[PDB]
Design a protein around this ligand. Structure first.
Ligand SMILES: CCCCCCCCCCCCCCCCCC(=O)OC[C@H](COP(=O)(O)OCCN)OC(=O)CCCCCCCCCCCCCCCCC
Ligand code: HEM
Ligand SMILES: COc1c(O)c(C)c(C/C=C(\C)CC/C=C(\C)CC/C=C(\C)CC/C=C(\C)CC/C=C(\C)CCC=C(C)C)c(O)c1OC
Lengths: 55, 352, 126, 431, 352, 126
């Protein structure tokens, strides 16, 4: 088998982001959870960086 | 549409619907097997789940049995409930749903498994080899299904229309009261069954003698003979098999199996010598075929044989009872042969 | 999970009453048009949600070439749906086609189930 | 001693074998199942099968003759085989069949017994011969709407639409002399045949050329014949290969040679010095494969073909393989190349040097048509060996790396992935 | 320890080591099969990986072939390298490692698969049925292994000591120079091989006639005959099979297969009629057995038959060449019969 | 992963030299005692770490009843080890027993591997 499938870590990466079998027909509505994870990451980065100067 | 019932002061009543549609009457290879294994399925008004469910609550169970001659739709219950299981068997005979799915998910499956336990017993492997080379297309039919001949669901249904007829069945009964049976039999769908005609063979069957066939098998090694005995030769091979299987015949420990079947127009005397060693088959068949041809006074086993056929019979329907006392000597004339297991190291007929 | 056995009850009744039937069916007809679905080659029995046992008793049971049929439509559906289009007008399922091909088995199985449910909780009076 | 080639109108070619017990004569028409059209497909395989219908084959059966026939894509052949002495017994029976007789084989009782058997023929093929079926469709999609596409044995469609008026429509156009070559193989001389040929007069439709079509072309594409009821999965894949008489004709056959051909059952196969094999075998990713560089007059198909009962892991199958193919451009071991050159030769041999005249015919007939002459084994080998690694690293560098492919298949190919995956594995990420 | 080699001006040399240890000489059921499939395994000084690895680099390949008579250890290469593959074959004959593991992981496996493709072709299923009922224990041996008889690794080794002897092999050669062969043959381990004796049968084989056996098979239906022809009857059935398989005999489209085998002391003329429909077997065998007994003037196919046996022969070792011209008429006297597929709907010998 | 083929080289040499052998083996003997392991029914070939291909070529190959043997010891080991005890003194593997039952195959396989390694990178001089 391929490495990304075999590795303990990259297998998740593959199976949730690379090799995941999606319905062929889904539209831009479904792009929301993706864009959801992106905000949560924007929240956490900028938050921490700000906390460094917050009282 | 015969009807008997031997009453008694017991707790467990029984029943049956002895039909004439075993292998011998099979349209295609093992269509009885698909029909034996379609019984007590869903009727058109009763569900096999409900049939099973209710039965336990009343305390009784059903069982479709197959053999070369019968498809005995027996039941078994507590006494006070006879008409239920009576109408039950009847209702199965007339109107079993015979749905496409009931086949693929319950009939064909259940059929496959029977043949599975078959392919791991060589004595039986050959007891179908006897019949199919001796009697041939008649009683020499494949007992259980094997997919070699594509029995569709249509072919299972025709065979149900065929064998399920008034002039082709025989109700039995044990611890049943005969009048009660006849009445409930008549008030049941049984009497409404298209009477048709019988298939029971009164005219004796065409047979063969000296025929041989061999099988490539992975398992124990077994060799087997087949004898087209008569309506007369019946009680002879009965006092023979019971002697060969007893402590009188010195060679009961050289034959693994030996018995005579009983039809209403024939029989078959098969002797099976089976063992792992492909030797012991050559060593206990070169002798067995000899000792018999030499001559066997079967008479000392006439006190035995009777006992071993007055305990064997418990079905209210039997063959020729009194025929025993007129036996004496035996001599093996002609015979058929099937060898199973290690073929390149098992006897041939030409040396037997 | 409103039951098919239950939709049968209601929809049979309405179909029988010449009173009701004349009132309802015009609309129902008008409805199964506005749905859009026969324009994606879809028969209505295609649409029925399957992720439940009954439908999986009901598709295991559905005749072979019938399932190959379903299949092609379901893929044709998705394919087109993703092309963000409707089929060539003459590829649409026609009003006589939209037949309840599945519904017997669904009903066949529903029946079977409700029976077993009952027969699991069947009580006794002495 | 070097193969003979002389023309007196009829281009007569022969190839002698002093150790042959038999010989063979026949014709090769320089127009095959790729000179046909969309709706006359299988006309060339229909012509072959009347030629072997009991009628004409009982004639030559008293005489002691056996007939051989085959249709390719660029070419089309009609061969007869017999003892070397009955060499006139061949030439005459050929003459009868192709200038004398016409409607003796073209009966309405013949032709409706051949077409009602080339119909059962092409209905066991597309029914049960998946590996070629898959292989055939591969052409249909790679060379879609273009000459090579038409399956050699023709569609069951354009094969029930064809009467005798159509067998001829192709005959009288493409069954000429200026498109044919007569062959002599096995145990006969050049001065035995070309003598017995100038012995006979007549001329059929002289001056006539056969016609032409739009030259073939190639385009990256798929065609997928999913069938989840078939116990295995068959796949064939390729790029725009190399033609017959292309500068890299041999360079490309050497590449095929490297990865080669597998059979997971023959323990011999399991040990071949093929790198790809290291991968595939771990989990038993397949039952077999094999490569190729199919060359035709106008275009070619370099790729490979595989069968597999391993459905969940086909996605690796195609992956390991197409990655290997990348090495051919960036990292092929020289010592791999030698094992290639070496093995090519052995294969290219049993091809050309088989003790069976009928093969040496089509081989000859086709080649002496396209380039005029045949090329000797020593000529071929002198080329194979010249080949460096740089030979293989510049051929893959244009032909293989990041180029459109052409997949086709059937069986359990749900696992066979998509086109933007597969195609993408033509390259590797670089800094 | 015969040695020939027909040179030629070619690029691809070949080779062989035609041995006498096919089925006919098999100790137990298919021990040749385990030995055919043990060749080009590891020797005691050479590794099968290295044997394969090096070969490609030199550009040549090896192949152990089995049949009823031979275990032909053929090679095939580029010319200039003959001694390599010469000593190779020799080295295999003398000292193949025969390790326990090489069996379980490469021999038994590879053996199992051969039989797999076998059990899905009924023509072959029956062509082992012919031999094993006609000739019996001799040439009527199981061709490929089948586990019914437990051939241990010991039993594979004895059979290697047996069949691998000087007086039991015949080196061949094509595009090889005869002197080169004889020399390298003599300098090879070949000459050091225990000479032993031959097993080649000059005395003709005991046969049987009228024997029949049938098989339960799921697949196409096929029926097959078997004829113990002579060292004389050789060229007769050769002009017969080539007529039956040709456009002369009107019934070439009623027989799926027909050919005669050639031993140095016998043959076997088997005709196979195979089809899915269990009918077409009853319909094209009730006729075929007739049309032949009626009488077939095999002579018009004497111009054919020669051609179809001067192309068939390419092995430098053949049987009786000139014997052809003395043929005329045919009549089917006695014969053996095997029916495969749908047995309850396929002919019997008693109606054939 | 110091190689067995390599331990062979070194340990054979030392065994051969009557010089070395007399110096070393006393200690080595003293060592394979202080280990404690024959007191948990363990033969030394039991101890060899298996999670690697060679040993899995070498256990697939190891004769049946031999593996049943290994097994019992390995379980006997664990069992006792967890009882925080040593076996009944007379259950201990005895000095003649601790035989390299596995070592051929390990060596057999190591050999085989190093060969294939070589034959994968075999170069060519023209
Ligand atoms: C943190 C990981 C660091 C590391 O050293 O992991 C090494 C790992 C080894 O590769 P592995 O697949 O484990 O090899 C087979 C052995 N079981 O190699 C890896 O796991 C690389 C995985 C990269 C992790 C990316 C996840 C986001
Ligand atoms: C789900 C993730 C988050 C959400 C929805 C969220 C929401 C908010 C909102 C609404 C405010 C007030 C913003 C304004 O009006 O100024 C705020 C402020 C703040 N947040 Fe977060 N927050 C998140 C994560 C974080 C994290 C991970 C940190 C890490 C330290 C963080 C640190 C801060 C700080 C220091 C402030 C005050 C400065 C400011 O208001 O901009 N936040 N947050
Ligand atoms: C089934 O269908 C799917 C589907 O499965 C997926 C996965 C996607 C793709 C969607 C995703 C990949 C969404 C995934 C969402 C997440 C992974 C969100 C998780 C995010 C976190 C858990 C945040 C954690 C973040 C940190 C630890 C970063 C903090 C580190 C910092 C701040 C370091 C900086 C500090 C210093 C001092 C430098 C689809 O589009 C989709 O539709 C077809």
């Amino acid at each position: 088998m391929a490495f990304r499938k075999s590795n303990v870590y990259l297998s998740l990466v593959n199976s949730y982001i690379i090799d995941s079998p999606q319905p062929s027909s889904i539209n831009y509505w479904w792009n929301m959870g993706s864009l959801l994870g992106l905000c949560l990451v924007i929240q956490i980065v900028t938050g921490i960086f700000m906390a460094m100067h917050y009282s | 549409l015969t009807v008997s019932a031997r009453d008694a002061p017991t707790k467990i009543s029984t029943l049956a619907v002895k039909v004439h549609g075993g292998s011998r009457y099979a349209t295609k290879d093992g269509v009885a097997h698909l029909l034996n294994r379609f019984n007590f399925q869903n009727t058109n008004t009763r569900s096999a789940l409900k049939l099973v469910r209710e039965s336990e609550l009343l305390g009784g169970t059903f069982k479709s049995t197959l053999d070369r001659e019968y498809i005995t739709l027996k039941a078994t219950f507590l006494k006070d409930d006879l008409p239920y299981y009576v109408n039950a068997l009847a209702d199965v005979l007339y109107k079993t749903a015979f749905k496409p799915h009931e086949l693929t998910e319950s009939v064909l499956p259940a059929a496959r498994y029977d043949y599975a336990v078959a392919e791991q017993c060589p004595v039986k492997s050959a007891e179908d080899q006897l019949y199919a080379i001796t009697f041939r297309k008649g009683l020499g039919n494949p007992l259980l299904y094997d997919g070699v001949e594509r029995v569709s669901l249509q072919d299972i249904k025709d065979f149900a229309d065929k064998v399920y007829t008034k002039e082709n069945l025989e109700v039995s009964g044990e611890n049943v009261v005969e009048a009660d049976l006849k009445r409930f039999v008549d008030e049941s769908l049984l009497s409404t069954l298209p009477a048709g005609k019988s298939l029971v063979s009164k005219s004796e069957p065409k047979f063969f003698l000296g025929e041989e066939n061999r099988v490539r098998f992975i398992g124990d090694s077994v060799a087997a003979i087949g004898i087209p005995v008569n309506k007369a030769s019946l009680a002879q091979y009965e006092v023979l098999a019971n002697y060969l299987t007893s402590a009188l015949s010195e060679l009961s420990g050289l034959i693994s199996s030996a018995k005579l079947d009983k039809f209403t127009d024939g029989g078959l005397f098969t002797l099976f010598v089976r063992d792992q060693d492909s030797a012991v088959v050559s060593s206990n068949i070169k002798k067995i075929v000899a000792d018999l041809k030499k001559g066997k006074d079967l008479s000392p086993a006439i006190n035995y044989t009777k006992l071993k056929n007055a305990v064997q019979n418990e079905s209210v329907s039997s063959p020729i009872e009194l025929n025993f006392d007129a036996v004496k000597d035996f001599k093996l004339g002609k015979f058929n042969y099937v060898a199973v297991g290690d073929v390149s190291n098992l006897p041939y007929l030409d040396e037997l | 999970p409103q039951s098919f056995t239950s939709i049968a009850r209601i929809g049979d009744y309405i179909l029988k009453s010449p009173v009701l039937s004349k009132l309802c069916v015009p609309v129902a007809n008008q409805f199964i048009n506005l749905a859009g679905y026969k324009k994606l080659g879809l028969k209505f029995d295609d649409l029925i949600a399957e992720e439940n046992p009954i439908m999986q008793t009901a598709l295991r049971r559905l005749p072979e070439d019938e399932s190959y049929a379903r299949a092609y439509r379901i893929i044709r559906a998705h394919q087109t749906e993703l092309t963000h289009h409707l089929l060539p007008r003459n590829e649409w399922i026609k009003a006589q086609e939209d037949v309840p091909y599945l519904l017997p088995y669904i009903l066949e199985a529903e029946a079977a189930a409700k029976e077993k449910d009952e027969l699991d909780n069947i009580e006794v009076s002495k | 001693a070097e193969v003979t080639q002389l023309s007196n109108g009829i281009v007569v070619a022969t190839e002698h074998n002093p150790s042959a017990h038999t010989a063979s004569v026949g014709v090769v028409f320089g127009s095959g199942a790729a000179n046909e059209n969309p709706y006359n497909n299988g006309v060339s395989n229909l012509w072959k099968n009347i030629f072997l219908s009991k009628e004409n084959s009982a004639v030559a059966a008293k005489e002691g003759l056996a007939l051989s026939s085959n249709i390719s894509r660029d070419f089309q052949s009609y061969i007869v085989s017999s003892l070397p002495g009955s060499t006139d017994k061949s030439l005459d029976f050929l003459n009868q069949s192709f200038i004398q007789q016409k409607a003796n084989l073209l009966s309405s009782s013949n032709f409706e017994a051949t077409k009602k058997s080339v119909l059962k023929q092409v209905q066991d093929f597309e029914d049960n011969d998946h590996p070629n079926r898959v292989l055939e469709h591969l052409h249909s999609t790679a060379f879609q709407n273009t000459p090579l596409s038409l399956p050699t044995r023709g569609t069951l469609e354009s094969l029930e639409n064809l009467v005798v008026a159509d067998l001829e429509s192709f005959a009288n156009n493409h069954f000429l002399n200026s498109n044919a070559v007569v062959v002599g193989t096995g145990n006969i001389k050049h001065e035995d045949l070309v003598n017995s040929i100038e012995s006979k007069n007549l001329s059929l439709q002289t001056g006539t050329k056969p016609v032409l079509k739009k030259k073939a072309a190639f385009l990256g594409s798929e065609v997928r014949l999913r069938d989840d009821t078939l116990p295995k999965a068959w796949i064939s894949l390729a790029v725009e290969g190399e033609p017959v008489n292309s500068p890299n004709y041999f360079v490309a056959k050497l590449a095929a040679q490297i990865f080669g051909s597998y059979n997971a059952f023959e323990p011999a196969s399991r040990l071949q010095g093929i790198k790809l094999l290291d991968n595939i075998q771990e989990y038993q990713l397949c039952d077999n494969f094999n490569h190729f560089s199919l060359s035709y007059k106008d275009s070619g198909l370099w790729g490979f073909s595989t069968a597999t009962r391993n459905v969940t892991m086909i996605d690796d199958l195609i992956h390991f393989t197409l990655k290997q193919w990348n090495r051919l451009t960036i990292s092929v071991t020289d010592t791999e190349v030698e094992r290639a050159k070496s093995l090519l030769k052995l294969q290219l041999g049993q091809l050309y040097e088989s003790g069976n005249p009928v093969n040496d015919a089509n081989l000859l007939g086709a080649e002496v048509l396209i380039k005029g002459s045949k090329l000797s084994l020593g000529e071929a080998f002198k080329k194979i060996d010249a080949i460096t690694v740089k030979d293989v690293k510049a051929w893959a560098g244009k032909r293989l790396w990041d180029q459109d492919i052409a997949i086709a298949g059937t069986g359990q190919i749900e696992g066979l992935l998509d086109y933007m995956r597969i195609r993408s594995d033509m390259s590797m990420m670089r800094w």
